Curated annotation (Swiss-Prot), chain A:
GO terms for biological process: ammonium homeostasis; ammonium transmembrane transport; bicarbonate transport; carbon dioxide transmembrane transport; carbon dioxide transport; erythrocyte development; inorganic cation transmembrane transport; intracellular monoatomic ion homeostasis. Erythrocytes. GO terms for cellular component: ankyrin-1 complex; membrane; plasma membrane. Residues 1-2, 54-60, 116-123, 170-189, 242-249, 300-313, 365-390 are cytoplasmic. This is Ammonium transporter Rh type A. GO terms for molecular function: ammonium channel activity; ankyrin binding; carbon dioxide transmembrane transporter activity; leak channel activity; methylammonium transmembrane transporter activity. Belongs to the ammonium transporter (TC 2.A.49) family. Rh subfamily. It comes from Homo sapiens (Human).
From Swiss-Prot, chain B:
This is Ammonium transporter Rh type A. It holds the Pfam family Ammonium_transp. One of its GO terms (cellular component) is plasma membrane. It catalyses: methylamine(out) = methylamine(in); NH4(+)(in) = NH4(+)(out); CO2(out) = CO2(in).
Curated annotation (Swiss-Prot), chain C:
GO terms for molecular function: ammonium channel activity. Changing N62S: Found in antigen C/Rh2. Component of the ankyrin-1 complex, a multiprotein complex involved in the stability and shape of the erythrocyte membrane. Mediates the primary membrane attachment site for ANK1 when associated with RHAG. May participate in the ammonium and carbon dioxide transport through the heterotrimer form. It is found in: Membrane. Changing R144T: Found in antigen RhEKH. Gene3D superfamilies: Ammonium transporter AmtB like domains. Restricted to tissues or cell lines expressing erythroid characters. Isoform 4g and isoform RhPI-Alpha are expressed in immature erythroblasts but not in mature erythroblasts. It comes from Homo sapiens. The lineage of its organism: Eukaryota, Metazoa, Chordata, Craniata, Vertebrata. This is Blood group Rh(CE) polypeptide.
Curated annotation (Swiss-Prot), chain D:
It comes from the Eukaryota. The chain crosses the membrane at residues 2-23. The chain holds residues 59 to 91 of 91 of the full protein. Component of the ankyrin-1 complex in the erythrocyte, composed of ANK1, RHCE, RHAG, SLC4A1, EPB42, GYPA, GYPB and AQP1. Interacts (via the N-terminal) with RHAG; this interaction bridges the (RHAG)2(RHCE) heterotrimer with the SLC4A1 Band 3 I dimer complexed with GYPA. This is Glycophorin-B. Residues 24-33 are cytoplasmic. The N-terminal extracellular domain is heavily glycosylated on serine and threonine residues. Belongs to the glycophorin-A family. Component of the ankyrin-1 complex, a multiprotein complex involved in the stability and shape of the erythrocyte membrane. It is found in: Cell membrane.
Amino acid sequence: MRFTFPLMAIVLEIAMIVLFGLFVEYIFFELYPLFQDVHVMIFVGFGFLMTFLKKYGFSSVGINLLVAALGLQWGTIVQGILQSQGQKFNIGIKNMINADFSAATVLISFGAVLGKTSPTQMLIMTILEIVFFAHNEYLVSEIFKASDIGASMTIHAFGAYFGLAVAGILYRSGLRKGHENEESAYYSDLFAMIGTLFLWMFWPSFNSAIAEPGDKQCRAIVNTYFSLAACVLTAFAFSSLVEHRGKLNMVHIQNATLAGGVAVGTCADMAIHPFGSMIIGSIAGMVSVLGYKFLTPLFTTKLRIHDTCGVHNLHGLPGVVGGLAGIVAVAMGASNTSMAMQAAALGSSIGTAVVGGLMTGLILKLPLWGQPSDQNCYDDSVYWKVPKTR
Amino acid sequence: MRFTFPLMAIVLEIAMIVLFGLFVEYFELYPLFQDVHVMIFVGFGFLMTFLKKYGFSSVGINLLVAALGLQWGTIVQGILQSQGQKFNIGIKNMINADFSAATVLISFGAVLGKTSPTQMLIMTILEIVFFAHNEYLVSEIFKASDIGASMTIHAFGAYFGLAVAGILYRSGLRKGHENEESAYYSDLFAMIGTLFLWMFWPSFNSAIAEPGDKQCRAIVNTYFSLAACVLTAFAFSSLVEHRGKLNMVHIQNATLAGGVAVGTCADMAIHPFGSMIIGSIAGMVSVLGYKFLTPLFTTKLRIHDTCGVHNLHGLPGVVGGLAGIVAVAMGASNTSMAMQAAALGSSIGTAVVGGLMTGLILKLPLWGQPSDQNCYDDSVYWKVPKTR
Amino acid sequence: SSKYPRSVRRCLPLWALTLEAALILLFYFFTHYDQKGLVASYQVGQDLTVMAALGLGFLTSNFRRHSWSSVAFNLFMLALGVQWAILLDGFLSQKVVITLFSIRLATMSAMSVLISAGAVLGKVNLAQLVVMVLVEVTALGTLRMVISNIFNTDYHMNLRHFYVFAAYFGLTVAWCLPKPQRATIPSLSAMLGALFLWMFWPSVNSPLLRSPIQRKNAMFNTYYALAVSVVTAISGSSLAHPQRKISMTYVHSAVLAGGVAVGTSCHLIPSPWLAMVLGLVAGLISIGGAKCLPVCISVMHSIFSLLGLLGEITYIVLLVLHGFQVLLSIGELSLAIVIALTSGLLTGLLLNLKIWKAPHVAKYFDDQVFWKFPHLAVGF
Amino acid sequence: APVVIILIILCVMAGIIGTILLISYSIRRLIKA
């Protein structure tokens, strides 16, 4: 009613404390440099990337921080339980890098329903989506034994289609034509560029954190580096191509420049060669810009699925492209493991994302969590004390 | 033609892909690489965002130019190292690619607000070739000690940009422009880049140093040089302004001159007191340059420097080169002193010649240069939101 | 008197250049130079430098018209404090051998002053901040030397009291000052600073520690306590506000509640559940302080002091599990508090001197006092 | 020899851009009139 948000948060935190006491007990100083970069990615790049809205910066960054902070505690619990099969487990550096990858998935899903959800809905969505993501990624990594070190399938596509399903269930008829608060500002776009640049710079550590030390980790770093390099050029070119009068659009520069890093995730550690990584990045940037120009209006107006940040065009379509690139790389002899398991991992990721997002959105659609009205969407004043001056 | 920029970008990307296919083959330096990467893409990107109506172009063209630059510099530097043969891509190649991107961004700081993205792509492509040839000359022919690259990066980029801006001189912008003015929150955003550059500069000066004593000496010298440079820059910024006011341009830029001027002597045994003296002189020179020499260049020499990158990179770069010459003369290094002097002179001359050639190429009215009225405006190339 | 600021074109340049020349001469006369894990050791201090500059500079930049001064003065104070802390730690713990570890300790000592300056930013000019930096670094070094002489602990390991010392020093200096708001974009920049402080803090409560196990256990304890404190602080901000809304300034203040709570005893917490419990307790205490302290100058500094004393108390409790030791540790805490209050009183008395050309009380939190702006009438 | 290769690459890129721009300008001058 008025105490639902703090009460749910304190109950969840006490539950996390009890679960940590029940199950959690205490190379590290080697992967810690890369963990710090992923943490900087999770808590700054996603946090400020979604602050492009002119009246939703506070909620964007604060709910990003809250969601990721609860995620690193819930993802640790669930992933450790799944790996240990119900027994007590010890936490090392890799255990806290996977918990920031679960937080990344939840933030990608948050990017779809941004501006139209309450913090209570975000708590519930984090709790459910971490369980669904962890089960799907355990399936992919251990049952299918697919090679998804950069997680184009388990993280990016999963979160994008999860958020699409949640936004589809939480569809608002009043926001289909548009909203007055759903537009960017100059300094909000500068903060979004802060987030974009941090994600872009630290993505190689994101892709190469869990990779096997030695040749595979170096290959992941190099491939992500040059894929992002190609993606920036192609994203700028196609943003100038598709927009009116050749004017660059800041949404394209803020989002589509990371599509190369998103798409090279599955093929990060494989011997796809730097030219192959650059080709993947160029194609991903072109696909992301074309998606932002054409498919997002089609998703919003025709399919009744509104995507606030366009996380489909950044995480899903480049994620599916990354899964297809992994299948092709397996076909072209660039790595071990079968094509069939890569295809099964991609299909299971998409399907589990859709089903879990449907269930989570159904739970979120209940009139209990204080979701805003159609008038108050993309407005910080619903939950935050906004200063008078900008 | 509005299709010049996407066509050129696509052609350049395809060329980079082909070159990486033809010439390129397949970890304790990775954190230093990440620090340099953060410097290149955030510090320089936001340092130039002080203009109230050019933040979008500054940060976006920084990202685009540096992204093209890392690939093109990788190819060119690898070709120069391997004498036209294939080469493996390690962490050092990525660090040197970011260094080439840094040089191009330093040059871009001079003509910010008066150039198109197409002109920036062309300038990047030509400047990388000139810079990499000069760097190969200094590193392998003269074999000078420039581990912080005061002469090969900062001075080279500064004088390259000065020559380009001199060729691209506009008579209508010599007395100022209404859009060439900073804003409050724009300066607040520029402080982000200033702080990131200041914090991560020791890794910039110690990334490719020899492991052991030289790397630690580079780190410590850069740190203390910056520490002294901040205090002296604040003092002289208060000194040169009316009623002791602090100018935001000085605090944004001149606080970083200590890292530039200590670059040549970073790995040398110049002692922390020597590094502090170098940083203090660098801060004083940078503030004096911003106060007096920039209007002199703009009005009398007809060379307009938008970000004042001369006072940050050229004069501190020349100071660092002369400091290297002196330190070799004082026995702090086992390099030749005449080689250090030759490196400084060759860097300056190659920068000037390459800047003249590139500026002559860029003056062709084909790349979509903005009019004199529309300079320092994002609306020429970007979709600008209605509100701030 | 006149509310228009007096000219500092001769005070500030002379003062700063004299300080820099004295530091250069002292480094020449008293300092000296001198592997496999050089990068790994250098990253602990680079993280401390990142926090000290960026997070502590932007965290206090939340003011409507004081962001420039906050960021630039924080940078200046860090630059002066690191050098003076190097020199003082050399002079009080023995020439001075400069290493990465010594730079790390000097960065911690400067972080103490930067945390203290949050209570006085917007009410002092640059010269007063120089005086505060010098006096606070000297007082912290004196406190560490006294504790090392009395309780036979190491001088460098006595730097653990730095947060509570900083809190009480800042409280006292702010109290001695003459007696006398936000915007969206400065609050977002302050959020950036608070995020950087929160993300790397696990690295602040692990520098003094040397054993890798103690360092691993400290990072793990601070990373989970900070997350449980962030959740608690963001959730409970609605309760401790008259308008029942989330306050961004309170979030900026109370993100580090768990890190401060377990800062002194992170290496002695054996299981993550206890660290999460301490983080939850710190978050609830922060909510209570936000709702309670304004009833009885800066509120965030008061909650910082409460967090520091709570962390000290839980350090006392967790020292016994891992009758005379309790009394000795309470004596350490009392001596640190007494020295902090006395040095804060001395600093506030010095800062009230008319020679510093302090701004008028009607010009507080205004960048127009210190910074050049266009289209302004200049001079009398 | 590396200098020759770099100059050759620059010549190829410059020739491609110049030929495309020349074709575009010729088509424009033939089409506008």
